[PDB]
Amino acid sequence: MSTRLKIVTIHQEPFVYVKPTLSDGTCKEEFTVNGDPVKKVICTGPNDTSPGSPRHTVPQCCYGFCIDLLIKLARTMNFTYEVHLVADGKFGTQERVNKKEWNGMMGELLSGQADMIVAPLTINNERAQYIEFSKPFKYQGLTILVKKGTRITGINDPRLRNPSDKFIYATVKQSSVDIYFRRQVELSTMYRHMEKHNYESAAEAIQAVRDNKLHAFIWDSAVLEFEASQKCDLVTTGELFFRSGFGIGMRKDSPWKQNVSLSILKSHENGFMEDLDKTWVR
């Protein structure tokens, strides 16, 4: 009978934290430094992250900037929901099979497995051809994460523009960063190197920069700057390239689309979005 919105998200700190439920199926009660309770939701998702492997769905705990944004959106517009983590663990790209298919949260939204994507989802032309994006909830860009001591100028460093097997730099597979290096001809020599070393997830790539396995990670500055502020052994290098925004994803015929963008505009104008930024990102 349900008219509950199927929300799809992905594991991406500090926007979406994913933790196991307690032995009773509830979430560990936590608080901010202020004494304010951390709002948490039950998000069903696969416990086996491994590729080309069976996905066993289990209830898990979700919280963060994007979950706090979901709760506010649901409260403003008066809708109910249920959250699940993207079955394949990807943001989403369009790949050739003759035919073209969308994977990740993009594929899930288009197939009807989701009614809404609530995640740090980059707004771009490729995805905007198939889905409706809300007005952005965050404006950021691409930066590079390296181990503390790795000296690099940025996107115009000779170690990136002239690739070699000595210095390994990558990004996340089936992500907007992957889309960006593929589309831009001026970055084909960088894409060609990256396609060989691209990781399944941001977490795996960040951990590989810690384990001296990956020398440079090209990813979202909102994530990378947050990671650098916590893990003092990692630093972000250079300034920002491909400045891009994050938005809520919906199907083009979604009846909520106008009310989602108005709620996001309201939240930026009344300081609520900046408060989320203060609680989770800074």
Ligand X SMILES: CCN(Cc1cc(=O)n2nc(C)sc2n1)c1ccccc1
Binding site for another protein (CB under 8 A): 123-125, 128-129, 133, 135-136, 139, 180, 183-184, 242-245, 261-262, 265-266, 268-271, 273-274
Q: Closer CB to Ca ion, residue 236 or residue 261?
A: 261
CB 60 within 8 A of CB 21: yes
Phi-psi region of 89 (alpha: psi -120 to 50; beta: other; left: phi over 0): left
β-strand 100-102 against 94-96: which pairing, if any?
A: antiparallel
Rounded to whole angstroms, the Cα distance separating 148 from 95 reads 36
Q: Which one of another protein, Ca ion, ligand X, none is in contact with 37 (Cβ closer than 5 to 8 A by kind)? A: none
Nearest residue to 43 via CA among 79, 71, 75: 71
Q: Give least dist CB 200 to Ca ion, A.
A: 30
E strands, 155-233, are: 169-170, 216-220
Q: Give least dist CB 84 to another protein, A.
A: 28
Question: How many amino acids of this chain bind ligand X (CB under 6 A)?
Answer: 7
Binding annotation: 120, 122, 127, 176, 220
Q: Which one of another protein, ligand X, Ca ion, none is in contact with 261 (Cβ closer than 5 to 8 A by kind)? A: another protein
Q: Closer CB to Ca ion, residue 119 or residue 205?
A: 119
Q: Give least dist CB 138 to ligand X, A.
A: 5
Q: Which one of Ca ion, ligand X, another protein, none is in contact with 115 (Cβ closer than 5 to 8 A by kind)? A: Ca ion
x-or-dash pattern for Ca ion, window 115-144, by CB under 5 A? x-----------------------------
Q: Quick count: other Cβ atoms within 10 Å of Cβ 184?
A: 12
One-letter identity of residue 64: G
Half-sphere exposure of 63 (CA within 13 A, CB side): 16
Q: Give least dist CB 254 to Ca ion, A.
A: 6
Angle between helices 65-77 and 257-269 (to 10 degrees): 120
Q: Which two tokens stand for residue 96?
A: 């050739």
**CB neighbour class for 268 (10 Å; exposed up to 12, middle 13-18, buried from 19):** middle
Q: Give least dist CB 153 to another protein, A.
A: 18
CB 98 within 8 A of CB 1: no
Rounded to whole angstroms, the Cα distance separating 94 from 70 reads 26
Kindly tell me which residue out of 41, 189, 268, 279 binds ligand X, with binding defined by CB under 6 A.
Answer: 268
Q: Which two tokens stand for residue 215?
A: 């020398």
Q: Closer CB to ligand X, residue 79 or residue 137?
A: 137
Q: Closer CB to another protein, residue 46 or residue 245?
A: 245
Q: Closer CB to ligand X, residue 84 or residue 138?
A: 138
CB 280 within 8 A of CB 15: yes
x-or-dash pattern for ligand X, window 126-145, by CB under 6 A? ---------xx-xx------
Kindly tell me which residue out of 64, 104, 245, 249 binds ligand X, with binding defined by CB under 6 A.
Answer: 245
Chain residues that interact with Ca ion, rule: CB under 5 A: 115
Which residues would be at the binding site for ligand X (CB under 6 A)?
123, 135-136, 138-139, 245, 268
